[PDB]
Amino acid sequence: NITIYHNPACGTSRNTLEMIRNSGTEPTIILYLENPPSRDELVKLIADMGISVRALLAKNVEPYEQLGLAEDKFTDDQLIDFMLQHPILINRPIVVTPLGTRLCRPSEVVLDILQDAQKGAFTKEDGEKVVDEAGKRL
Ligand SMILES: [Cs+]
Ligand SMILES: [Cs+]
Ligand SMILES: [Cs+]
Ligand SMILES: [Cs+]
Ligand SMILES: [Cs+]
């Protein structure tokens, strides 16, 4: 039982999703821009990902720029509430499996939490080889 918080317009998210599939399971796909996590759920995700609230913020998106979030003037809960109100601020993708939750940047981080091994070689969109046919990480 796997969930991905996916943005189809993001290569890292696309690569991650295909690596999930290459492990033999079709995840539940949450288009977080339209269906963001509830506050409780977002707090849980951050906790399980073991990163700071700020480390989850997507830079170079309009609200990050306009709300001045680069500046160290925001408590964690201020940042959580901005992410809820402006889901494009949630960096991508977040993946949940029975083993754990990760912000999969770079995409191959997802290999940590996938239970089943890649079923064969995996090469990212741009041609970057990730695992060979034998299953070794390159
Ligand atoms: Cs929700
Ligand atoms: Cs806008
Ligand atoms: Cs693993
Ligand atoms: Cs393999
Ligand atoms: Cs790339």
For the chain, the domains span 1-138
Measure the CA–CA gap between 18 and 22, rounded to whole angstroms: 6
Measure the CA–CA gap between 24 and 45, rounded to whole angstroms: 24
Collect all residues with Cβ–Cβ distance below 8 Å to 60 and sequence separation of at least 6.
Answer: none
Measure the CA–CA gap between 128 and 125, rounded to whole angstroms: 7
- DSSP assignment of 12-66, as one string? HHHHHHHHHHHTT-PPEEEETTTSPPPHHHHHHHHHHHTS-TGGGBPSSSHHHHH
Nearest alpha-carbon partner for 106 in 2, 11, 36, 7: 11
Q: Within its chain, how far is the Cα of 21 from the centroid?
A: 15
Q: 1-138 has which fold?
A: Glutaredoxin (3.40.30)
Measure the CA–CA gap between 64 and 116, rounded to whole angstroms: 36
Identity at 52, one-letter amino acid code: S
Q: What is the phi/psi pair of residue 27, to 5°?
A: -80, 165
Distance 39 CA to ligand 1 centre (A): 8
Distance 63 CA to ligand 2 centre (A): 8
- Contact 4/31 with Cβ under 8 angstroms? no
What one-character DSSP code corresponds to residue 126?
T
Measure the CA–CA gap between 92 and 10, rounded to whole angstroms: 8
Tokens of 107: 């995409």
Nearest alpha-carbon partner for 91 in 123, 68, 129, 63: 63
CB atoms within 10 A of CB 5: 29
Identity at 1, one-letter amino acid code: N
Technique used: X-ray
Out of 9, 10, 39, 115, which one is annotated catalytic? 10
What one-character DSSP code corresponds to residue 102?
E
Tokens of 110: 């997802």
Is 104 one of the annotated active-site residues of the chain? Answer: no
Tokens of 90: 């949630």
